[PDB]
């Protein structure tokens, strides 16, 4: 039920945005969103790790020597695991690491993280990052500094607004994401989440029905 003031790059405010409590006042669920972020990073894991088993390494077809009478260990090929240059036994092969959590688990984790930010006044709405027609990291940085003192911020902007995302892209602690792409991992990174009026309205309207 929070009422976040919308703030303009001039240092002023225009109005306020109502945050529905079914969407920004949810009790957080540490275990649930632990599972959600762990599944997220599992999907990010490029599992491109591979070895060669006993039969994939080069050579090894021959039996190295006679099986009896030589006074030596019985050896079936030179590519056996115990050999130098031999095959790896239970070694890595490529894996897909994504796991498919239910939709409402993901949605609830989103709402819980955003509620966690809202309870502590870490959600901001702004008309836009910088006055348009041209990117400017200097002025957008100054405005964002007035807006917050913390290190990491999410900057949730609509996809069409390129001048804004360009002017905030090169700040070291700033992460830019689209409202329809919002996930629990990026909002838990951020100390503050800085919406735009359009992006806040868009996220509200995508969950208003």
């Amino acid at each position: 039920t929070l009422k976040v003031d919308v703030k303009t790059p001039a240092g002023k405010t225009d109005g306020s945005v109502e945050l529905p409590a079914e969407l920004f006042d949810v009790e957080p669920n540490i275990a649930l969103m632990h599972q959600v972020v762990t599944a997220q990073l599992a999907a990010k894991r490029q599992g491109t790790h591979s070895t060669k088993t006993r039969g994939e390494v080069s050579g090894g077809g021959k039996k190295p020597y006679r099986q009896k009478g030589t006074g030596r260990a019985r050896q079936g090929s030179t590519r056996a695991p115990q050999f130098t240059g031999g095959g790896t036994v239970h070694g890595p092969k490529p894996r897909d690491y994504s796991q498919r959590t239910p939709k409402k688990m993901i949605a609830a984790a989103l709402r819980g993280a955003l509620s966690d930010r809202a309870r502590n006044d870490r959600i901001h709405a702004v008309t836009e990052l910088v006055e348009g027609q041209t990117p400017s990291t200097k002025s957008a940085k100054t405005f964002l500094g007035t807006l917050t003192e913390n290190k990491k911020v999410l900057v949730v902007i609509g996809r069409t607004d390129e001048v804004g995302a360009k002017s905030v892209r090169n700040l070291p602690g700033v992460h830019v994401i689209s409202p329809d792409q919002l996930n629990t991992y990026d909002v838990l990174n951020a100390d503050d989440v800085v919406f735009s009026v359009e992006a806040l309205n868009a996220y509200i309207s995508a969950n208003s029905k």
Partner: protein, 145 residues
Amino acid sequence: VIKLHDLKPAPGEKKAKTRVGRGEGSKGKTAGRGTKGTKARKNVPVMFEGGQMPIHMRLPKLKGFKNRFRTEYQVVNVGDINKAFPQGGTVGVDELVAKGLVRKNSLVKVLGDGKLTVKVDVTANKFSGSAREAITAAGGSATEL
């Protein structure tokens, strides 16, 4: 303000894997297999009994046939109509699917298990005699499709 390092699995969620054959402190030199035999290196199939006639071979096959032309019905008991419809009214198959009493595309037969008290107009593929008596003795009417 919960951050990514404040996240933790629920107590009792994650159990440690049992790494076996990693010393005599836990499970070593046999990895819980005991000494030699068939079972010391491979397995035994579940349908093996030692060469005596297995359980699935000394017993008769169940009598009968399957009747591929079976007409199966998804069944509602009359007592659920009370809960689903506090006032009664017209109740077809598809406004009975919305209440989650049957599956979406199937043949529906109504059975008379509970007790029906409201004025209802039931339409269904088939009815029970007890169900029909309950429908009409409570003041409603029932028609097949």
